[PDB]
Amino acid sequence: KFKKPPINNPSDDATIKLAEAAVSVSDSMLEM
Amino acid sequence: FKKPPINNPSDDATIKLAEAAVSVSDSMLEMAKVEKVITPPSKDNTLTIPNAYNLQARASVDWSGPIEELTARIAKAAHFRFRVLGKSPSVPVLISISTKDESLAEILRDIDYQAGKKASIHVYPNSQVVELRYA
Amino acid sequence: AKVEKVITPPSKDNTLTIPNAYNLQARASVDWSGPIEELTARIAKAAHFRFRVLGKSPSVPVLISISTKDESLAEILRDIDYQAGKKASIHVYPNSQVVELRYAKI
Amino acid sequence: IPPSANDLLLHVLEGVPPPGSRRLVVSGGDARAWLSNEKMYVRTNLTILSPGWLASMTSADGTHAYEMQKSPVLLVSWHGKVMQLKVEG
Amino acid sequence: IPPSANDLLLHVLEGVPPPGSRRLVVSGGDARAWLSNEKMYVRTNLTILSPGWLASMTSADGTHAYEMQKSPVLLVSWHGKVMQLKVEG
Amino acid sequence: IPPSANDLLLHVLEGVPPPGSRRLVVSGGDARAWLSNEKMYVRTNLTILSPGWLASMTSADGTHAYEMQKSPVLLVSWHGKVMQLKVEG
Amino acid sequence: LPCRVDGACDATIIKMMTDLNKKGIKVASVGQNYLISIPASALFADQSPRLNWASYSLLNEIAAFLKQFRKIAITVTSYSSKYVSVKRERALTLARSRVVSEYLWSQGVDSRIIFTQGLGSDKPITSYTLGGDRSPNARVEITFRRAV
Amino acid sequence: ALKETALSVGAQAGLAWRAKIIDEQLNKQARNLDAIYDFNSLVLEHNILPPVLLEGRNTLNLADAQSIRISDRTYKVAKQAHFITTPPTWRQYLWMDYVKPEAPKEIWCIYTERGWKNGIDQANTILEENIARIKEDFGGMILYRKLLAMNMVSPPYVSHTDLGVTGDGSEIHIDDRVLRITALPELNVNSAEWRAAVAK
Amino acid sequence: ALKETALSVGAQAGLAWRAKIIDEQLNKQARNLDAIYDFNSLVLEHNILPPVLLEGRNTLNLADAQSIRISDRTYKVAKQAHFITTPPTWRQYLWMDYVKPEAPKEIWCIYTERGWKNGIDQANTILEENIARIKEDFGGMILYRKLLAMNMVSPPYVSHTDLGVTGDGSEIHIDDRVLRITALPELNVNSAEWRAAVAK
Amino acid sequence: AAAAAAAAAAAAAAAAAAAAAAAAAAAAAAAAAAAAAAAAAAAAAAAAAAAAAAAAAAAAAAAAAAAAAA
């Protein structure tokens, strides 16, 4: 039996692209 | 037991196609041999990394524009004096530095490089001054 | 290639500016068709060389396409320097540990 | 004197489509394409190789934005792999 | 020189509607809204946050009166809680 | 002063047909023939003998390109053998 | 239509992964860094840069396991225990890894680079130093990162 | 044809269902999105909404066969700075619209599933452009605050003409301050006073 | 007549099938054709696509009964050098088009086999001209690099008018370089400075 | 689909499907990095089919005649 460690909840596409926007606005924010 | 290669030329036309491929790829290389002209690193004209301990501070720059302002602030970030010799032309000479962590003397190395021959950078590290000349 | 290499003789190599090193004598095999800097960053990462960039990379990409099998990393960087003729050049400083990609002035 | 770029490449350097566009679905790669007026604009971070583009910008994070004529296939490099992307419209 | 406010904000700072209006029912919060001429006016003591208002007054007791364009939802703060109010008309 | 050659013989010295042509199938020999405007053009490396041509070029590798009027048979020498080639169109 | 599977299935990935761990080729699976660790007894002859003929079957499900992933650079690096000197040893392990990567790009990888190198017991995974290629230190390792 | 209108039945139902799911999926992350898209503490000193600057680096235009123009960076002022009363939330930019569609064999069932995923990913592209628009607008204001530090733009120059008691005897306004923006935020081309982002 | 439309059914199906077979037969040799038709490292110093020169040796024209003109070599500049952004691949020149034709006794069977080989060798002639066109275009660029060594053509003379910061305050471009081609690559007729290909 | 590791947990956009052990080999969205290398279109890699024509031949939008699809 093989398993990677973080088996989290099932996410959805909305929070996937909200997180992907959120990291670049955090990086832009951070550097400013 | 082993196998032939999967995308092998084991076919009488594909062999001629691929011997032609290695013949044109090395004939491409000896083309790039005859026109690729280098300058030797004895005569490279660029800056060398001036190995001072204030210059090995890890820095972070995002910018494009006129060289003197980055070299002024790279001097007062390095705690160095900044001298300019020469006359700044009416079109300014414009750099583009975008790294989000790289060391400071190498930031002076690619400003010397993106200056090229419109301007250049010397560092004198015993006196702790960086300096920018024109032509 | 014959008429070009007779009508100007190739004066020098690039092993003056890319010299080999112990930990550059690891070997690789590569097919490749992308831009140059991500390939060179992978070469220097597996050479344990710090990789750096001089000059701002142009608007059109500097595209190389290396297809080869088992040569040394030093000769891979040499053929990368050649296939980017007059747009970039690889420099290697082996008493330091740094592979450099130099873009052109134009 | 040539024009500078298109300034709408600033918009498609973000994810936002141009005003008054048509969406183009892109298969087989991470790109988004819109068609404004007989020209498509592609937000990607791949490198488009074959059909040739008229204008390009690139953001801070290596995302590029390309103005090009409408071609139904795009050829990119992904990570040295030659790759195909397919657009409908 | 700009206009001062609307003087009909004095009327909707009281509870009285403007002359020649249409009532708007407000759900989910203590507010009253009227529509005079393609503009609604809200008597509340909540704080409207999202859709933006053109004019405001406030009485002695913290009742506010807002002139704004017609938006079918109002977002307020109640007591630090972000809250929604819904208007029909 | 005569014309030099036809410059479209440079194209049919390569394998590429002239722009706006009609293909002619060639039987019984290694040649390709196209018909541009009441004139056929033959890429071959054989030597056409009987019906006479109006213009000729030859590449580096002994491939020849001939401008001639439309004749339904071509007579060539192959390697000293008199040979016939047959064209439809 | 666009393709659902890319010439691979996850059931076959874990089927080869159990079968390689049953034959003792240990597959570590950390993040997307994949490691398959091969003892040099299980491929070569002792202190030699030469494959045995039966060990290309072991390389067959190594290469058919390497079919299954989208990958950019495989690096293959080999190291064994001490035999004569570290210079002879590093020549051995460089020839060792370059021979197994020559067979792996004879076979099917969709990798764009295979980097390949050898070391002179400079990274040994146990302190127990029994012998030559029967040491568990004497091994080749094939590590990559599965792209997206 | 009946198969086509089966697909068209499935499309709008899938769009409205996906719109619903991502609306309370947005509302589950409501305080997090107020942290992300905090326009409220990005506004200027006289409650002026900052303008949206667009950065495009490393630009080529192929104008014709004879000529290209490259430029290294391009900054554009889009939808210029202006007096905002209450700052924008994320909900004007991200909230997709929920209506509940009340409008209703084997080929019908398989194409209403392919209509259902067509409605789902078409609602996903609407949401993707909504996130794209808020990332444009917010990161443009962030790009101002970079260039306002970095001296490539002007700050807005307000003017407060204070007036005393104002009006006739039927109407007074007591402290009557008229606030205008005279100078808009605006990129300077006199480029010697620019700055450069060197940190440690 | 039914035999004729049987042949016409067989023709396009044979063309599309032969188009399919040579498309993945091209894709099996994809890296080999990038080695052969490497346009990428044939471009010039300012990413200029080189022009296609055509060589015709040993030329006669019979103009009329009274007069011929021979010339020994003819060099033609076809589709002159120009600013390319990304270099051409082989796939614009060689890829034949795949559509899947969905449009359908004894005489039908024998003429659909003769239609099938008519579609096969007609697709072969399309592929033969595609290979012919890429061999023209690529070997023309090779013939430039011969004559650029051999001094029978000019190299292109670019001009980079550098501009500083450019525009109004709503739009700046920081390093604004306009690159033009002034002099096109062009065969010189002043023939005393020519070269000659002598090797060992 | 994601077979025998576990069932498919999520469907990560800008990626493949996410099984409930690891990342699967089955593509989730249309916009993942699926290895297209053989297209199937009239006048692909020239410009597309200029749709306004109604004749025998098929003309591309770059004004080439798609003789392999006419």
Residue numbers in the entry:
A (entry chain Jd): 24 to 55
B (entry chain KD): 25 to 159
C (entry chain Kd): 56 to 161
D (entry chain KH), E (entry chain JH), F (entry chain LH): 273 to 361
G (entry chain KK): 41 to 188
H (entry chain JC), I (entry chain KC): 58 to 161, 173 to 268
J (entry chain KZ): 1 to 70
Publication passage describing the model:
The Type IV Secretion System (T4SS) is a potent weapon used by some bacteria to infect their host and can deliver effector proteins into eukaryotic cells as well as DNA and/or toxins into bacterial neighbors. In the Gram-negative pathogen L. pneumophila, the Dot/Icm T4SS delivers ~300 effector proteins to the cytoplasm of host cells, in some cases causing Legionnaires’ Disease. Central to assembly of the apparatus are five proteins that define the core complex: DotC, DotD, DotF, DotG, and DotH. The map can be divided into two major regions: an outer membrane cap (OMC) and a hollow periplasmic ring (PR).
